[PDB]
Write a protein that binds this DNA or RNA. Sequence first.
RNA 1: UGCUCGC
Lengths: 34, 1105, 46, 50, 65, 50
Amino acid sequence: RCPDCGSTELVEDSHYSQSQLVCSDCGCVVTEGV
Amino acid sequence: APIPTVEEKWRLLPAFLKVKGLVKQHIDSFNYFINVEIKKIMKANEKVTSDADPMWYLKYLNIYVGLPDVEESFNVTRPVSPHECRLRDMTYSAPITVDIEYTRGSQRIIRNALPIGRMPIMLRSSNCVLTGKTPAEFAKLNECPLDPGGYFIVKGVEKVILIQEQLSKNRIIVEADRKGAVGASVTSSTHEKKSRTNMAVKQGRFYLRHNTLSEDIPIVIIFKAMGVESDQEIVQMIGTEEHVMAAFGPSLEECQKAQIFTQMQALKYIGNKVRRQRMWGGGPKKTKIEEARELLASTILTHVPVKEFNFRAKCIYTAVMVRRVILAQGDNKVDDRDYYGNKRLELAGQLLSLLFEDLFKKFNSEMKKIADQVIPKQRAAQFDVVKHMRQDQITNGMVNAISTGNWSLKRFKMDRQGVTQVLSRLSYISALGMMTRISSQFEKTRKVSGPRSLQPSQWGMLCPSDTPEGEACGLVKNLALMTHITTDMEDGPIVKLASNLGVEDVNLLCGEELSYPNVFLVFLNGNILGVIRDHKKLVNTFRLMRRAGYINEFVSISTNLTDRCVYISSDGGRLCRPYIIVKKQKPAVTNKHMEELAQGYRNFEDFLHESLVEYLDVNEENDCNIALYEHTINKDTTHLEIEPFTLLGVCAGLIPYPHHNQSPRNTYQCAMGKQAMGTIGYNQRNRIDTLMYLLAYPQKPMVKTKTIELIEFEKLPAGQNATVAVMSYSGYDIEDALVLNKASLDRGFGRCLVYKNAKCTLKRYTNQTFDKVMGPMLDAATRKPIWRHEILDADGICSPGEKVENKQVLVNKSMPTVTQQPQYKDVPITYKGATDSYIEKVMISSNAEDAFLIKMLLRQTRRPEIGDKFSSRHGQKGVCGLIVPQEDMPFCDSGICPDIIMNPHGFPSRMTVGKLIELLAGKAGVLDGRFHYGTAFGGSKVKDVCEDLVRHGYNYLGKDYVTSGITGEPLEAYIYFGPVYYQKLKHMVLDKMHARARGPRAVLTRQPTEGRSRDGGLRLGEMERDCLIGYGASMLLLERLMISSDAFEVDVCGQCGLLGYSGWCHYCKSSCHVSSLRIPYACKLLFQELQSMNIIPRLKLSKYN
Amino acid sequence: QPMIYICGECHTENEIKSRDPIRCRECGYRIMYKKRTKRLVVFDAR
Amino acid sequence: IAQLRPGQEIDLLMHCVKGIGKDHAKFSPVATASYRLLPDITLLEPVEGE
Amino acid sequence: MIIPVRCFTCGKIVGNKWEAYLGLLQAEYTEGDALDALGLKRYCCRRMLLAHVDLIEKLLNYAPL
Amino acid sequence: IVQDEILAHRLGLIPIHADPRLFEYRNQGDEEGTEIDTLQFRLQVRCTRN
RNA sequence: UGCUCGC
Ligand SMILES: Nc1nc2c(ncn2[C@@H]2O[C@H](COP(=O)(O)OP(=O)(O)OP(=O)(O)O)[C@@H](O)[C@H]2O)c(=O)[nH]1
Ligand SMILES: Nc1ncnc2c1ncn2[C@@H]1O[C@H](COP(=O)(O)OP(=O)(O)OP(=O)(O)O)C[C@H]1O
Ligand SMILES: [Mg+2]
Ligand SMILES: [Zn+2]
Ligand SMILES: [Zn+2]
Ligand SMILES: [Zn+2]
């Protein structure tokens, strides 16, 4: 779940060679860096 | 009265290319290996038997390699084309079978066809399916007719075995040591052992050093041990010159100091200096003198043979060596290693022969071990080798040695690397030039700068200009256009003719005759063949007999007057070059012979047989007189050069008018043409490689060399002719840059295609589960596949014809996690790419292991832009600095606007007059509809193209009246317009563009990864740190090397000075003195590694105040 | 669902399902390409 | 436009719109539109003979 | 691969004059007189037609068909 | 055998005899095209053995 | 790890 809005729309979207699991509703970066 | 000149003489070159030339070397070597050498290797190990249970044996009768086949079908073979092997990622090999006879239970059982291995078949060889085929049959097999071939196909990749270069064996080398002592060395190499024995003069006396002796011993003791005991005979053998005796005096005095005067005493002294090879198995039983005699007879000077413990030949050999050392100790006539007359070239044939011999010996040893282990204790069921003849041994050995490229022969103790290399498919010229490459034994790791020089011995044999620019400059070379590598001969008739020609036996006379001024020593492959008087008659008779045909045309004979030695070379690997024989100021080749050759009456073999053209070796041409042209022929001329432009190689042949340019320009042009973009072959569409570059509209050059016509480069061009105007425009072409026309690029100029391969495998594991591809995960909201799975077809595999974007799946691969219900996790093949790609084809194949191989060929159509590297076939590499519109381009009276504007300032510093000559010739040719020739040391002259220009109404110097497109006013100076053959290089700004966000880090050291494919970041090297220190920017250096790279926060205990975790010290079992601290992660790793090394760093922290 | 493929030498439309040995009728070739998609694709003349 | 073989097919639709040559060279209506100054050769002295 | 439609420098339509040029090669015309008869005055179109290699048929020989 | 992008590039260079004054510039976007500011050319060729 | 390259 997202820590800010509590939504479960956590998508793994790599933005310019940066792996990042981010919420799809409010855009809160859950996890980043691998 | 000028000497008549044969105009059609150059016609001798193509005929030579009909049977020999560029690619025939490796083909002939592989054919000789698979047809003759393999049978000899099998005969050498025809019988193998075990010591236990005698009267049992395994006898080989005859071995066959057969035609290439594939083991895909269940226990059935099938003919397979090389393109199919490329597609299926398998090897192109043929089953090595052999017929044998053995004894199972003392009853002879014979097998007529029993496979034992798989030999990878070289393309276009004798057994290859591609030979003897027509271009239509090549099209039926999906193979380019212009493909050079000669390369192996293993697991789908193309490997080429480079020609190895090494020093000649069994030759005395007189060289200076580190301390300046001029000593000698001889690496006697036989089929079994190679031993390098040296001789030094460290203390005015000659000591002989070998790896089998504990300490170097005086040479006089070895003389006394080898049969000759009288000192007078030794001195006579060394020489009768006063200075020779004066130099050898100390050795005689040192020998007389000891009590060594007989053969037994010397042998005992030698045996005292002999150390056992770490407790050799078996009772010695007083072998000291016997070991010494065996080392003298067999180990020392292996190439010099002793009939029956008769060291007369070995004594004469070491006496000649001592005499050479004495003579070299005066005038500094030190032999040089870079002299290519002492070089030997090993092709793929000899390497494959050694490898097959080693593998067969290992197989025989394994079979003997299995026999010894099975036969004496198993059962009354008689053991047979057929149940234990593993067929994967030789196959796996060959495959690994060809693919990995590292060769480890324990029987010969040879540990080589980089023998095989991946064939470069950048262009046809790239592969054609890489096929004729030659690596050096130096195996570059350091700055030798002694073989890297261009020696004059490379004349006619190796290309002087063609060399990789960089760290491999000078050690990686290319063969010339007209060259040949000799093979081994029988050496029988050579000895017979030498004995019949008056060569006195060395055993019949003492060594004093060796000191006579008129007596010349005759050698044979490093062995003393004998002595002779009036060596001119001997050399003339030997050359005439070789011309007649009774002696092989590749047997070389040379004379060294300084050492007075007649060398007769018949070993393989020597470089030879054809030359026209000149007798009494007139060449043997006339116009009538060339007319007959043109009409087809005769071939090059007829020229060889009729004593018209003969092969000369480097050592032989050292003594011969060669004339470049007919007008250069004088009274003292023995041979005539066929064609001077044959000096250059294949890559150098593309250079138009290379003699008008600078040598670094030619080298850079060869290096860039090896990377030139263009068509590969007629089967480039069905071909699927990991990276391919193609040109949209390739055009053949207007100024083409005869080498281009010979190599058929005009059928597969790698560039385009553009109307280049040499002028300065807008200041965007300051240093090597060029300005491109927007309208030209819009109409297809420079348009390129990049094909990439994406391969995936669905393999069956040990458990009965397989990788399966799921369908497109349709979105229930819209009843359509998601954006990621949009391009996938119904079977989960992307269909050709659509465009692929970044982070999109091509194959929806899911693999099981077990190896009760199977659990599949998704590992889809995502497409990493900055720009979009189009799928051209998807190939699905099935191997014998039920693994499905899927290959997608992605295509990208790219237009020239800012950053693309362009070449001009003259080493004038450039980058597109600006793309101006058509109206901004200057225009002539006819209305022609230039496509490429290049800077003139690049001409004076580089002196590329050849570029101007090529431009003028191309302009004349496009005006009169002709193709001018830029042949080296020839070609169309400037006067002819000037007349062609003045005839068509244009200026005789290329400079034309041009009006400026911007201001509309004429220019004060005329502009040099003309068509130039520009070639685009693979170096693109799109592939080289890189930008790094935070991104991933490495597990060991938390720093950005190395490469761009790994999404790495740029490294601040040591010199950058030095520059930042010199600038004094402490905060910038701290932010770069600590904050932005490997920043971390550790916990250090202020009591013990050790590293804690989560604000707690396990060492002191307390947390009051633990404090946080910023630190590079590499520094913490170093501290932990030092603590592991018992070097404990204790950190005493303190307040920042 | 009929999944169709094309042989490397016969060039005939062959329908094979999942987990089938890759082969083609009236021949023995084992190179099987996929047919071009039927979806509309837009290209730019630039 | 292209060359085909039996079995191959080319099916497409082409949408053409108005455009200027500055955007792309394919809109250029003129193949070669240029101008030159009119020459006027004059003889300083009367030249006769061969 | 195939003859380009537009000339790189000027832009004259040259793709339609390729096969006829081949006809002039099938006839007794040489290179220069054929290029003159085709109407190529400037040397850019002459270079375009003369230096072009017809690789489309060699590729169609390897086409699936 | 000709690539799709190369085919589109070759088709783009083909001139059209249409009068440009009777058409207008297509607005930004609007890939569907209208009667005023676009033209359609259908090219369907199926090669087969004689 | 190897090797071919790019300056
Ligand atoms: N023979 C061979 N050795 C390799 C290869 N890659 C790495 N090595 C060896 O591993 C060492 C370098 O390891 P790295 O390249 O850092 O391994 P890595 O890329 O971190 O491995 P991953 O974490 O799996 O990406 C070298 O000393 C090589 O001997 C390879 O492809 N072939
Ligand atoms: N091994 C290397 N180490 C450092 N810099 C290098 C190296 N190789 C190439 N470079 C870079 O390339 C530049 C070398 O070019 P330079 O030698 O001055 O001209 P060039 O290559 O001789 O060209 P010409 O042959 O004169 O046309 C300078 C350097 O920054
Ligand atoms: Mg540079
Ligand atoms: Zn502590
Ligand atoms: Zn078929
Ligand atoms: Zn033109």
